[PDB]
Amino acid sequence: MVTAKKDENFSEWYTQAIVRSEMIEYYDISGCYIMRPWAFHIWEKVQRFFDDEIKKMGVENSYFPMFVSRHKLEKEFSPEVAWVTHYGDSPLPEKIAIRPTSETIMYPAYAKWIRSHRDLPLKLNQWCSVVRWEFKQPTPFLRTREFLWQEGHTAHATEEEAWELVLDILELYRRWYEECLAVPVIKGEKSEGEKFAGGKKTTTVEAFIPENGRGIQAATSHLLGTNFAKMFEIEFEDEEGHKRLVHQTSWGCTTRSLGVMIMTHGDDKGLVIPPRVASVQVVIIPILFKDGEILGKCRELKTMLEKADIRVRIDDRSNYTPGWKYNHWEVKGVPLRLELGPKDLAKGTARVVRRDTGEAYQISWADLAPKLLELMEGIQRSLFEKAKARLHEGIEKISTFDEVMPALNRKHLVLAPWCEDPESEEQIKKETQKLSEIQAGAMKTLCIPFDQPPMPEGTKCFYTGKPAKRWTLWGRSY
Amino acid sequence: AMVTAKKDENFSEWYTQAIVRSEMIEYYDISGCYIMRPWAFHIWEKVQRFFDDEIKKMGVENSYFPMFVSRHKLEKEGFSPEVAWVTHYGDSPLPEKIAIRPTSETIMYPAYAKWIRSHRDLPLKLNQWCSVVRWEFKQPTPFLRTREFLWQEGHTAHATEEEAWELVLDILELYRRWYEECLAVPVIKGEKSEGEKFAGGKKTTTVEAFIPENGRGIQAATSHLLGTNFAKMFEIEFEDEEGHKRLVHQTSWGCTTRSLGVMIMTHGDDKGLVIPPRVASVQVVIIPILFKDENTGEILGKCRELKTMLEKADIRVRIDDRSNYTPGWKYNHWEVKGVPLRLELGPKDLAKGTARVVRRDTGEAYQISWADLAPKLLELMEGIQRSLFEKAKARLHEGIEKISTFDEVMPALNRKHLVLAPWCEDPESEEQIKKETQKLSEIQAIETGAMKTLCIPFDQPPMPEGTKCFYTGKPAKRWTLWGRSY
Ligand SMILES: Nc1ncnc2c1ncn2[C@@H]1O[C@H](COP(=O)(O)OP(=O)(O)NP(=O)(O)O)[C@@H](O)[C@H]1O
Numbered sequence: 001m002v003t004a005k006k007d008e009n010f011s012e013w014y015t016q017a018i019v020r021s022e023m024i025e026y027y028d029i030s031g032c033y034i035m036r037p038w039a040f041h042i043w044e045k046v047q048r049f050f051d052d053e054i055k056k057m058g059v060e061n062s063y064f065p066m067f068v069s070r071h072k073l074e075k076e077f078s079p080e081v082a083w084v085t086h087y088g089d090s091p092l093p094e095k096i097a098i099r100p101t102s103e104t105i106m107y108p109a110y111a112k113w114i115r116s117h118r119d120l121p122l123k124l125n126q127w128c129s130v131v132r133w134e135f136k137q138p139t140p141f142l143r144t145r146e147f148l149w150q151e152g153h154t155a156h157a158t159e160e161e162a163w164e165l166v167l168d169i170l171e172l173y174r175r176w177y178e179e180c181l182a183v184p185v186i187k188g189e190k191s192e193g194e195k196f197a198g199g200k201k202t203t204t205v206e207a208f209i210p211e212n213g214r215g216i217q218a219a220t221s222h223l224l225g226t227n228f229a230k231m232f233e234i235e236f237e238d239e240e241g242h243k244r245l246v247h248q249t250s251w252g253c254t255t256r257s258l259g260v261m262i263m264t265h266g267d268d269k270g271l272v273i274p275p276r277v278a279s280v281q282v283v284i285i286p287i288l289f290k291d292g293e294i295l296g297k298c299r300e301l302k303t304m305l306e307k308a309d310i311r312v313r314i315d316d317r318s319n320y321t322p323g324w325k326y327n328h329w330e331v332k333g334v335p336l337r338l339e340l341g342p343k344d345l346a347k348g349t350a351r352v353v354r355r356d357t358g359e360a361y362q363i364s365w366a367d368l369a370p371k372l373l374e375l376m377e378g379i380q381r382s383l384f385e386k387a388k389a390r391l392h393e394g395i396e397k398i399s400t401f402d403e404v405m406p407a408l409n410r411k412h413l414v415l416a417p418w419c420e421d422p423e424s425e426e427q428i429k430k431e432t433q434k435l436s437e438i439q440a441g442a443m444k445t446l447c448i449p450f451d452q453p454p455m456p457e458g459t460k461c462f463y464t465g466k467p468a469k470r471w472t473l474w475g476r477s478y
Numbered sequence: 479a480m481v482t483a484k485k486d487e488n489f490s491e492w493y494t495q496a497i498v499r500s501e502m503i504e505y506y507d508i509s510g511c512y513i514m515r516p517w518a519f520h521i522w523e524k525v526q527r528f529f530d531d532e533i534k535k536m537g538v539e540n541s542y543f544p545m546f547v548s549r550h551k552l553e554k555e556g557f558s559p560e561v562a563w564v565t566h567y568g569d570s571p572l573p574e575k576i577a578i579r580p581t582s583e584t585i586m587y588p589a590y591a592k593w594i595r596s597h598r599d600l601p602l603k604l605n606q607w608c609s610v611v612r613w614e615f616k617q618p619t620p621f622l623r624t625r626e627f628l629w630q631e632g633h634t635a636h637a638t639e640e641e642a643w644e645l646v647l648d649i650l651e652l653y654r655r656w657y658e659e660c661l662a663v664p665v666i667k668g669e670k671s672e673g674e675k676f677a678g679g680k681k682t683t684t685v686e687a688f689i690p691e692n693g694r695g696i697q698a699a700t701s702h703l704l705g706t707n708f709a710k711m712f713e714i715e716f717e718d719e720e721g722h723k724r725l726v727h728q729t730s731w732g733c734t735t736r737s738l739g740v741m742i743m744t745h746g747d748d749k750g751l752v753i754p755p756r757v758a759s760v761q762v763v764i765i766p767i768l769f770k771d772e773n774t775g776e777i778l779g780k781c782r783e784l785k786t787m788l789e790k791a792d793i794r795v796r797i798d799d800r801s802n803y804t805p806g807w808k809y810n811h812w813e814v815k816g817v818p819l820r821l822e823l824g825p826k827d828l829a830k831g832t833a834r835v836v837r838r839d840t841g842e843a844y845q846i847s848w849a850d851l852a853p854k855l856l857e858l859m860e861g862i863q864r865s866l867f868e869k870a871k872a873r874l875h876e877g878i879e880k881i882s883t884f885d886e887v888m889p890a891l892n893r894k895h896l897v898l899a900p901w902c903e904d905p906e907s908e909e910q911i912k913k914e915t916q917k918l919s920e921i922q923a924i925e926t927g928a929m930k931t932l933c934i935p936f937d938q939p940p941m942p943e944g945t946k947c948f949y950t951g952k953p954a955k956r957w958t959l960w961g962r963s964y
């Protein structure tokens with residue numbers, strides 16, 4: 001049972017929801033959390049979706065070691081890297097690092113495997129864990145010191161083909177968030193301050209948490225250019241015979257995704273899981289009080305529902321009350337609850353409640369599969385749309401710096417015309433830190449959206465005064 | 479690039495050649511760690527999906543617990559020298575060092591003690607896929623013994639021993655499948671001796687394999703009946719239906735990337751790898767008989783058509799349309815990699831509406847009409863799969879000598895065979911037999927020699943009454959499988 005109100009104390013709400021749903025268990029090593037099956041099975045679904053998709057692009061999976069030697073890693077962040085120094089009581093000759101990211105592990109093998117134009121495109125992915133000693137406050141899913149991710153890394157003959165892939169991947173991240181988790185996101189380009197300094201252009205998919213006004217990078221996909229190619233000597237021979245540097249990409253997305261889905265659709269009763277990723281779509285609860293028939297129809301219903309590929313549990317555990325079950329599967333966010341007592345049995349009917357609105361329906365045995373399929377689409381589409389609206393009511397389109405803090409104090413992002421000059425962003429981060437401080441924080445660029453509004457002729461940068469270039473989305477962030 | 483070392487003559491170099499030249503493994507600067515490229519990784523994905531679908535059917539659920547465990551928690555209760563310790567992040571010293579997981583009992587079991595309070599919480603059945611780090615003292619081998627390796631580990635808790643034991647055996651059966659049905663590697667189910675079992679458990683069942691080229695047995699996977707000692711240690715108790723506090727009955731089980739190695743070694747030959755059709759990335763490689771004399775479109779058009787037609791029958795296909803290599807170059811390339819079937823399509827073939835199919839395991843050739851390709855290739859794949867298994871099974875049973883007396887031991891070892899012997903199962907004798915076989919192996923060493931128990935097989939050959947222990951001379955309980963091992 002959940003008692004903190006999503007709209008009052010958000011961080012306590014979140015903790016209760018992830019704990020009492022049995023998604024997360026607390027752990028003694030700071031920044032690390034145990035992922036219990038209810039949370040893990042959802043990761044399995046997004047993992048499979050993404051994995052299948054990238055496979056259709058010819059990306060292949062691999063596994064590179066979790067250790068990188070010191071001199072390889074330290075060749076061109078630093079404070080977050082975890083170092084192994086001993087085995088038993090014996091010190092290693094040279095300390096070794098646990099993978100924070102894999103560029104320095106993968107790229108020397110690339111330099112080696114890539115020799116001609118015939119060896120391209122090389123497209124590889126891996127699913128693994130990563131360790132970073134995050135200095136910021138940890139949060140289950142969103143920011144953990146060990147997290148699970150995929151990282152994709154690719155090499156191409158031309159910038160054209162690599163950029164095409166950057167976008168294809170970005171679009172798969174939209175789909176992971178938008179089609180699987182029903183979380184709206186905004187495609188965009190990172191400002192030169194926020195991008196991966198190893199690359200030429202970083203693209204992003206960005207999300208928003210209404211309850212605390214924080215934007216959050218949902219995933220990332222980089223046009224690396226050739227900088228890593230010169231650094232690692234990844235070059236090939238073209239059609240002619242001239243040696244050329246490859247054009248690279250990398251891209252990653254994490255268990256952070258689960259966190260965002262939980263915050264987006266969660267309510268005061270706990271989780272709400274979208275049907276496309278719910279391990280249990282429909283839970284069937286037999287009502288039993290004061291004394292056998294019914295258990296038999298329940299089983300028939302499951303088998304019916306499974307021909308529709310509907311994922312179904314029967315909670316027929318006799319050591320729990322029906323009301324306990326109601327509450328349990330509610331807090332866990334099961335999309336549909338199908339009840340069945342004596343009175344229903346004779347009617348040939350079933351009482352079904354949907355988790356997102358609490359609405360109830362009486363539905364005859366014969367109408368279940370198509371009606372539940374109907375209802376499940378509605379829940380999914382409906383969670384997305386209520387979140388898309390929340391997202392858009394959360395962004396304020398604006399023209400001057402004096403608009404900012406009021407918008408930030410309403411826990412909103414702002415969309416603003418900016419000249420995209422280095423200094424401004426840092427000045428904006430600091431002045432906003434200072435105004436937040438004294439109010440007793442900082443606002444950064446989240447992205448430059450692909451979907452640009454029109455920019456009239458003499459429109460000015462909302463902060464410098466210089467002439468604006470494009471519309472940039474700003475806010476407080478994770 | 480061909481395989482040059484002969485499998486039977488220069489086994490070690492053969493192994494290194496086959497895994498490298500086939501593009502399965504790339505070498506790496508940290509010892510005992512290896513890169514796994516797609517060609518090997520894909521196989522790990524196949525066995526992982528298989529095993530995973532099966533345990534889910536049994537009510538096991540997946541989870542992810544942290545790779546870190548505190549020193550206090552790991553050291554709660556000769557494993558100690560293998561643990562990797564993190565002492566610093568960036569330039570900053572930790573308050574205490576932290577261990578990278580070598581196995582997950584000391585991370586999972588305190589959580590089990592929390593979650594389990596009542597009979598209604600039972601059974602609890604979890605699994606996790608993850609990597610494990612152990613600073614192995616022995617010489618590293620790609621797949622078979624690595625300092626980082628991938629595995630699943632399963633850990634379950636039950637109200638009764640009976641239900642735990644049942645699970646231990648259902649799991650063990652899934653390990654047999656993993657090897658026999660997926661990788662086509664024969665294995666023997668058995669019970670470890672007192673000396674070889676997990677010391678944390680009451681009984682350890684195992685699935686054992688045999689590598690003929692070096693005569694050494696190798697443990698393939700493991701499944702333990704843990705009893706109640708861990709529940710006692712970690713305080714995993716539940717109130718039963720009458721409110722009495724009972725200890726839970728536990729199991730754990732694991733299988734690793736080792737299994738890919740066992741598969742490579744079992745089916746490989748002098749040309750290189752042979753991959754069973756059930757787990758090969760590519761089952762059929764289509765090779766167009768082109769030189770860069772031309773590309774008129776006629777032959778590739780048809781290769782595309784065929785790919786599609788086979789792809790509809792769930793056959794995994796690749797066209798090697800690379801313009802700078804001869805067909806013969808390409809035959810060898812895909813042989814080294816172990817693609818079970820090679821489809822040849824040349825102008826002659828195009829002229830007749832046929833294609834020529836060659837199977838990697840025997841080299842036999844088949845002329846097949848386009849229309850008959852899908853069903854005929856499926857048939858050939860079942861045949862390949864079955865035949866790889868049958869041949870390995872016979873090499874396994876030809877590698878075991880049933881014996882009666884200790885005098886028969888060293889001759890049986892020198893022929894690179896295992897031995898199956900009546901054994902009293904007293905624990906001092908296992909140690910004594912290890913020592914004696916070590917000393918005798920050194921002495922007849924011309925230039926790991928110890929013979930140990932591998933398992934007491936579930937499949938027991940007959941035991942005529944009054945049979946004596948091959949070593950002690952006391953009455954012999956059962957037959958025990960022994961050998962040199964990894
Ligand atoms: N500690 C973490 N825990 C979980 N997810 C993370 C963590 N750090 C990053 N991510 C996610 O993984 C994606 C790719 O990682 P990466 O781009 O290396 O992150 P990053 O540059 O360190 N972001 P940030 O730490 O906020 O500056 C990020 O865009 C996040 O969505």
Ligand SMILES: Nc1ncnc2c1ncn2[C@@H]1O[C@H](COP(=O)(O)OP(=O)(O)NP(=O)(O)O)[C@@H](O)[C@H]1O
Binds near residue numbers: 624
């Ligand atoms: N270093 C390794 N690399 C790959 N696979 C391994 C490794 N160590 C163990 N395995 C496999 O993992 C299975 C279960 O692990 P576990 O029972 O902990 O092994 P173990 O007791 O360390 N075996 P051993 O080291 O030979 O005494 C073993 O039965 C092996 O098949």
Ligand SMILES: O=C1CCCN[C@@H]1CCCn1cnc2ccccc2c1=O
Binds near residue numbers: 077081101220250251
């Ligand atoms: O986005 C990704 C994900 C895919 C591959 N890597 C890129 C960028 C990684 C950026 N990054 C992020 N934190 C780090 C921490 C320590 C060392 C290095 C890094 C580091 O390189």
Ligand SMILES: O=C1CCCN[C@@H]1CCCn1cnc2ccccc2c1=O
Binds near residue numbers: 581582612631733
């Ligand atoms: O068999 C398995 C596989 C299933 C899960 N774990 C069990 C027991 C592993 C035994 N083991 C093996 N090497 C270790 C090394 C260091 C510390 C502890 C251990 C250790 O406990």
Ligand SMILES: [Mg+2]
């Ligand atoms: Mg970071």
Ligand SMILES: [Mg+2]
Binds near residue numbers: 194
């Ligand atoms: Mg950053």
Ligand SMILES: [Mg+2]
């Ligand atoms: Mg051992």
